[PDB]
Design a protein around this ligand. Structure first.
Ligand SMILES: O=C(O)Cc1coc2ccccc12
Ligand SMILES: O=C(O)Cc1coc2ccccc12
Lengths: 172, 171
């Protein structure tokens, strides 16, 4: 995946977030530190926060990442789209995990109720574990795909089933 | 400890540490001019070649941090393997492959013997991280069976289209 996509993936709370543009940062709601009143040196009063279940978007009133171009954010993707989940792991290793996307779903995972776009890993069989699959520290990582000449971001990593085969992308 | 730490840059491709003393690779990526590998003189290295599969056995522990893994001669038809691809970007690309018959295949002009496979990452990579490239040769084929990782060969060849691959196997 392009270097300019990996540069937008930022360590955040108990996981990750993704810069869509100089002013717009998206993440998974449950990774946000709950008592927090300041982000990138800005008070809450100078930030527009839009929450929909496990999807959260931060819009800043100043340019936090002026090195970046604004890119396209969509509400999930067509069934059958192959996405990459942009996962960073201990030591500058980069894991763009291939996933085939399916329907919008409501599921129960480890007791909690989860809603988003379902998908199935294309990395191997029985993908439980860090080598072929996702771990809790991956939450907030972006789902991206190449559409003709450009790249699209279509959600953030929210959950994976016990077996590891099914994942859920939280969507705008 | 990770499977990924066993995948090592080697010659014009990659190889894989099965144990502290055993390294497997694709025959065509091995340097043809060398006096040593991994600091051990070639004098002290056992080399077992069967077509595009090569195994090295060292006389001392090169990777003492590792346990020995199960190495088999390919896998049952229908097994979904992962090919553990490393790229010089620092990207790690595990790709699902459905394994088929042992065969001699015509792959971009040349005859290659090994276990055929089909990538399961769909129509086209299309500049997405979904297929193999020539620099990936020697990457291992692995699958989980009960509680154990099994390694069953090395990446030898792939078609232009991308979808057919060949896994070179022991013996
Ligand atoms: O490139 C990086 O990963 C580090 C970085 C440098 O200033 C930043 C501001 C916001 C988000 C991330 C960064
Ligand atoms: O080969 C197997 O036993 C399982 C399998 C993996 O990808 C498939 C695609 C279609 C039909 C079957 C399969």
């Amino acid at each position: 995946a392009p270097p300019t996509l990996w540069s937008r993936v930022t360590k955040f709370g108990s996981g990750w977030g993704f810069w869509v543009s100089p002013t717009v940062f998206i993440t998974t709601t449950h990774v946000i530190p709950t008592s927090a009143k300041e982000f990138f040196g800005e008070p809450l009063t100078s930030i527009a926060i839009h929450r929909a279940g496990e999807f959260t978007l931060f819009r800043f009133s100043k340019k936090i990442r002026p090195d970046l171009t604004g890119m396209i954010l969509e509400e999930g993707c067509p069934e059958g789209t192959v996405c990459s989940v942009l996962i960073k792991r201990d030591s500058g290793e980069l894991l763009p995990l291939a996933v085939r996307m399916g329907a919008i779903a409501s599921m129960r995972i480890q007791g909690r109720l989860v809603h988003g776009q379902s998908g199935m890993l294309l990395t191997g069989a029985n993908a439980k574990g860090m080598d072929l699959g996702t771990i809790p520290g991956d939450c907030g990582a972006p789902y991206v795909y190449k559409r003709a000449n450009d790249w699209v971001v279509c959600g953030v990593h929210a959950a994976a089933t016990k077996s590891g085969n099914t994942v859920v992308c939280a969507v705008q």
